[PDB]
Each structure stands twice: as C-alpha cells, then as structure tokens.
Design a protein around this ligand. Sequence first.
Ligand SMILES: O=S(=O)(O)CCNCc1cccc(Cl)c1
Length: 658
Amino acid sequence: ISPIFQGGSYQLNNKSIDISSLLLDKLSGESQTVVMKFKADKPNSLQALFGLSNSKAGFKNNYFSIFMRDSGEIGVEIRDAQKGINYLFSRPASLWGKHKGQAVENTLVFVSDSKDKTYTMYVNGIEVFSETVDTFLPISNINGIDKATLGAVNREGKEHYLAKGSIDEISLFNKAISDQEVSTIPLSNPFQLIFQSGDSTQANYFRIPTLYTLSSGRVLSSIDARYGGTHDSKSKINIATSYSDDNGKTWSEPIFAMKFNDYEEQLVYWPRDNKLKNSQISGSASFIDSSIVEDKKSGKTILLADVMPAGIGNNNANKADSGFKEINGHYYLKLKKNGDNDFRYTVRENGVVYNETTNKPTNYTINDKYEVLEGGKSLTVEQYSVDFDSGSLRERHNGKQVPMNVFYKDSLFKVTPTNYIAMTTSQNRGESWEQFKLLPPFLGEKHNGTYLCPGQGLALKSSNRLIFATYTSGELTYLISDDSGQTWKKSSASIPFKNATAEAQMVELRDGVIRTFFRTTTGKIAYMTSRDSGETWSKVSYIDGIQQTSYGTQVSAIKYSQLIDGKEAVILSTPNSRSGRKGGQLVVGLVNKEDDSIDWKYHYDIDLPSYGYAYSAITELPNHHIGVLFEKYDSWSRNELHLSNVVQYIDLEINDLT
Ligand SMILES: O=S(=O)(O)CCNCc1cccc(Cl)c1
C-alpha cells in the first residue's frame, strides 16, 4: 500500500524539525511502519532521529522515539506514563557511518504490529530486533501525543536527544508491512554478507573471518559458524566456507569444512539480557579459529582449525597433557573408556584401539572420521538439541542417532579434555573438504598443544614451503611443511609475554624474508622477522602509530602485489583504538629496501572511530582490489554479545586507501 506521509531532504543540524501538522492527523489504527533513509557520519553521543511525543508539562515520559548512539546502536522507546508502559528495545552495532570517506545512507524499517503484539526493527536489510510484548502500545496511542518531530524528541516544550545527521527520505504507513514486503525495499548498502543468519550453516552467529585468494582466481573464505551465541568454546561451532569466482561480487552457499554432529545445527536466538547472556552450550564438541593456505605443488587447499572435545574450552583445557602418548618417537592419541578413571587406551596404527595396561588390542577401532567401530560396526550416540523453553538453557536428547565420535560427551571412548589442531584439505578449491586429521604434538608429550592463529597460512612464493603460525605461552610456534602438509615441523620463536593471545599473521617482504605481525598485551602490535624462510626468527619489535587495547585484537596482513609510491607495500587491518574494538583501519606501509623497515604512510578509516571493528580478514582480489571481511562490532564487549549479521564484507581500491 501507499504512505500516509512522505518527506525528504531533511538536514538535522542540532535543531529539531516539526512535522506535526503534516503527519499527526494522518496516523490511524494501531499498526504502523516507519521507513527512513538517513545519514549520520558525525552523530552526537545519543540522538533521536524521529519522535512522536506529548510535549505538555507533566508528560515528559509519554513519547515514541527512534534513537541512535555514537556506538552505532539503534533503538526505540515507547512510553506512556498513564498506561505504566516504558518500552526500550535496541541493538548495538546496527549502523554504518562512512564508507570510502562518504556518509552511508542507512535504510531503517521499523514495524509496529498490533495484531502480533510485536515490534521489529530492520537496518540495512538486517533484522536487529523483534520483540513481542504482553501489553501492546500502538505508537500513536500514547496519551496526549501532540508533536511529530525529526531530529529530537519534544519533552515539556524542549528539544531532547538533539540530532546531527540527515534524513534523506522518510515514509509512514498505517499498516504493519510483511517481512516479504520489507525485503523488497531498496537498500544502499556499502557492504555484503557472505555468511548470514538462515543460510546453509543454520548458525545464527559468526566470528573469526578468513580470506584467501586462490591461484585460479577463486577467493575462498572460512569462518566460525557459531551456534550457541558468539561465545568462544565451550559451545557448538562448526567451520564453514564459501567462495567467490567473480572478485567478491557474489559468494557460494556455505558448506562445512569441519563439523561435529553430537549436537543439532540449530538457528537459535541467544538471550542478550544480563541474567542469561552467559548461557553456554556445555556438552558439545566444537571447532574454533580456522586458517587457510594454498599449496602450489599439489594444488590442494589446506584448512586448519582448533578442535575441542565436549564441554571443553581453553579455560578447562587440560594444560600439562598433549592428549597423546609417546611410544618410541611416535605419538598415539590417548583414549578413556566409559567407567575407567584413567586413560588406558591408545589409537595405534590403523585406528586399532589398544589397551595399554595389558598391551592387548581390543576389538574396537577408530575410523578416519574419529568415529568408534566395534568389530567393524558403527556405534552411535543420541544427538542433543538445545532450547530456552523452560526459561533457562536445556540440553537434551532429541531421538536422532549419529555416529559415535571420540570427541563426543556420550562416547564410549573419549579423547583427553584439551585443545588439538586438525587439518582438512580440498581438491576442488573449496567445493568439498576431506575428513580432518589431527596434527601431532610439537612441544612434547606433556605439553598441551598450541593455538592456531586464525586467518591465513603462508605459501612462500619461491618454494614449496607452507607455514601456519600458532601460539602458546611465551612463544610463537610456526608449523612448517615442505611436502604439501603431509608432514610438519615446528619453529619456535620466543616472545616477551607469558599467556598472551599472540594471534599472528605473516607477509613475505621478499623471497625468504617473512614478517609476522601479532597481537600482544602491551597495547601495541608486535612483529618479528625471519630471513631464512622461517627457520629462525628475530627479536620482537613494536609498531608505533597504531593503538590496540591492553587485551588486543587479531590483526590481518597482506603483501600487496603492486608498488605504491614506487615502493613495496604491506597492508595491515586492525582496530586503531586503546579503548575498545572500534576505529577499524587499513594501514598501508612502504618497505625500505635498505633495512626492511616499514613506513606506515596511509591510514584508511573503515568507518567511524567510534564504530565497532574487531577480527578481520584481508585479501588482494585478482583484479587488485582489496577484499575485507570483518567483525563489524566490538567482539570483546560484554554488551555486544550474540549479534546477528555483523561479520560483513567490503570491496576497496588502493586509491581509496591512499
Ligand atoms: O579475543 S577474543 O576473546 O575475542 C577471542 C579469543 N579466542 C581464543 C581461543 C582460542 C581457542 C579456543 C578458545 Cl576457547 C579460545
């Protein structure tokens, strides 16, 4: 249907605009839709875009507003004192501010539906909240409403929540338009989604993006598909992948590179209230932190991720145990049988489960999928599903049987409760992935394994060498293969922090010269250099000119193929901020051929300094554009947990950055 009101080209410069005469007497019925296209690249701390209010003395809490914060949060208030109603619905990190230095036109759709008693907010094609209430309050049913305002709320005759920005278009409808109708509304998005709520992964949440340009020109991406909110394990998380064959313009429906079946893949709205937001799927196995590389020699794509058995995160991860037993230069996966207090088994050659106390083999074997077989027959366990129907999180059997896996809670044989690294490969550039294999321990039998650095591995240009950075307490532990990832060795490089989350990414400055940039606990990004293709590593230095928080954030980095200002160039992606994960930048550095030092010459602001930017992935697209897939929110903040569709993709050109 048609708008009852339509206006545009409104400039909000800290002075409200009264549209009462134009709008108020057009409002009728109990259901309304607001469609508003607006820019705000210099927002005030807290500002209202739109208000309906009782402006009379004594009725300061009788109003409806659509408001935003300079954090990028969007919300509404719906208030009527006489009715005793004070609704406040919102979601952090819902907005864009700037893109390529130009103010972004956000498309906001707010639906107030009296029939379903539900308020729903979409921004830029993304539903950011949908709230059902017992007692519905139609927005124009507020006692004594006498003002319709743009860029403030009129309370007791004064302008509250004064806005800075513009409303290029605003329409109102005396109808609650359908989800279908919403999706036909044209958008002006500066970004794309590769992974998103409702896709093939059926995860409502995603974290830890990666990007990698394959030699055929295909761009591949991997990500944590996170089911139990945005929590790091413990949770259910699979590793999903998608690829683009047209320079990032479009992307394939995701598939899984690594998945477990002990818990159902469920699209779940995770509670965001302070009482329940720390609810955590607690009995599921999971993957976390993926990294990609391509091997010139075989042509295979190789993906690694951390693996966690059921219940297990990095907090309850058995340090002081690798999960393997050393038996004469060889490492065998340890197992514990249902009922025993110790790990009395190992998985020897051909997956034969072997009793260590009597040195007899059992009739149990472990297949290539880490599934348990008895006498060649597939054992099963019953799957779990989760729900908050009772009010709190419940994890319960759902009737479906799935293959018994040693990483599962209900398994007859269980691996050691600690962190492992798995590897899978693709022969068809990400169209399918093999069953993963665990990597062996590198730091000894009684050292719990290292943590994979998410993002990219490094494929050295002039050899067959493959390297994946990993971290542990007191060092970076590079994993090195010269035979297409069939065998790996480690190269240890000491760093001056104990228990840092030293997420590290590498660039090749020139043949055999690797610089690694990594996250620290110092508020500055660090780096070290190898000049022998990763055999040995320099001492640690720090970058000036970029700030991180004390706890730090992952940094992504590439070596750009083309000269810039006549020099070799490296591009870093990172939040630039000592307060939180915001102020995203790409920083372009020019290499000094004399000494391999880097002049950080250009800083490109991804969006506003106050808007969220966390983990990121950068790649040089085959057309020499830059692709960026990143968490567009603060993934540290306890106020921004469990947000949907915040991992977003943008395309940039080098001239945009300079
Ligand atoms: O800096 S963040 O807190 O946003 C993400 C830190 N992830 C570290 C990790 C790695 C492997 C397993 C687990 Cl459980 C946690």
